[PDB]
């Protein structure tokens, strides 16, 4: 499960950053998360994994109808290439999106902090596989990386939607539904972690340079991802990088799984078998 | 032209999106911290 957990975190996050549909990027972020708790499952940390489900439930669900708020308002368009400037145009959704993004990154004293950083802190402070640690650390940085992409393309940019703009969130059903999950996400982990009885042994004696790495790794994941994302502002010659050509097409996984074995078994049924 | 002009211009920088509400945040900090400081001083 360390083997499966580690690869799941990378590949889903690796394909996450190079996608364009809002729903796709958010979903890939989930599948990156489901990679996390099973990594924690392996090293005698089930309850933290189960606690990670609780905190992940709040903001991850939230990120969807906030994107759903953008999608329906801006004429059911899911391509990140067609929003921008929604910060001052969609205030509540922009606040809700960045709250979920910060929570999703385990940023301190929030829903994510009470689960993710304890997980990243615990995974290193144990006798595990080395290659799993490098992957979880990189995944967390990539976890923040596509989060910047969502805020950068969807909100912090010049508008790109069709001319007739119909964006609006003033419907009370939209406002109240998101607000409930908002006030939930701000505290959630603080209430739950302080309240549930101690069920594991929180390690204490532990050096600084992997204590801070729960937040260090995402600082760069914010930093260079922002630098590479805003590079699109500069008028530059377009060239498809091979790694991008790999990542953007879902790491080539569907084009082989969903074509090669499916063709063979179906063909085996016709040529052999039935005939 | 409209995509870059009108009210849709003057887009906030990337960081300012994260630091949204910091002004009122730090404003609520001093009142809350000052309240605790006197309450702890009374204690």
């Amino acid at each position: 499960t360390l083997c499966l957990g580690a690869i799941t975190t990378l590949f889903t996050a690796l394909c996450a950053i190079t996608q364009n549909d809002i729903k796709k990027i958010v979903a890939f972020s989930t599948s990156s998360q489901l990679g996390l708790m099973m990594v924690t499952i392996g090293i005698n940390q089930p309850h933290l994994a189960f606690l990670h489900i609780c905190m992940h439930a709040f903001f991850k669900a939230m990120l969807f109808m906030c994107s759903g708020s953008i999608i329906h308002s801006l004429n059911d368009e899911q391509d990140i290439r067609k929003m921008g400037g929604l910060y001052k145009a969609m205030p509540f959704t922009t606040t809700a999106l960045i709250i979920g993004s910060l929570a999703l990154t385990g940023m301190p004293y929030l829903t994510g902090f009470y689960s993710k950083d304890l997980i990243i802190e615990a995974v290193n402070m144990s006798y595990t596989n080395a290659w799993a640690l490098l992957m979880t650390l990189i995944a967390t940085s990539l976890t923040a990386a596509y989060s910047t992409r969502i805020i950068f393309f969807a909100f912090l940019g010049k508008p790109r939607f069709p001319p007739l703009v119909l964006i609006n969130e003033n419907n009370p059903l939209l406002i109240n539904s998101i607000k409930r999950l908002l006030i939930g996400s701000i505290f959630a982990g603080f209430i739950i972690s302080n309240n549930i009885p101690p069920m594991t042994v929180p390690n204490t004696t532990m050096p600084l340079y992997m204590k801070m790495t729960a937040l260090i790794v995402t600082i760069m994941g914010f930093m260079l991802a922002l630098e590479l994302n805003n590079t699109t502002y500069y008028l530059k010659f377009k060239y498809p990088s091979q790694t991008y050509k790999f990542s953007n097409m879902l790491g080539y996984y569907p084009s082989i799984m969903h074509r090669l074995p499916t063709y063979h078994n179906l063909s085996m049924s016709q040529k052999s078998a039935s005939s | 032209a409209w995509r870059y002009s009108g009210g849709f211009a003057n887009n906030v920088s990337f960081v300012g999106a994260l630091l949204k509400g910091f002004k009122w945040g730090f404003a609520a900090f001093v009142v809350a911290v000052g309240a605790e400081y006197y309450l702890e001083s009374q204690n």
């Binding site: 145009a89 119909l166 003033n170 | 009210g7």
Partner: peptide
């Protein structure tokens, strides 16, 4: 059918917001 919603669409200009 009948419109008259609290909002109104705009053409390439900033849509109206509300105090709330």
């Amino acid at each position: 059918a009948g419109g008259g919603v609290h909002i109104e669409p705009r053409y390439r200009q900033f849509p109206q917001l509300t105090r709330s």
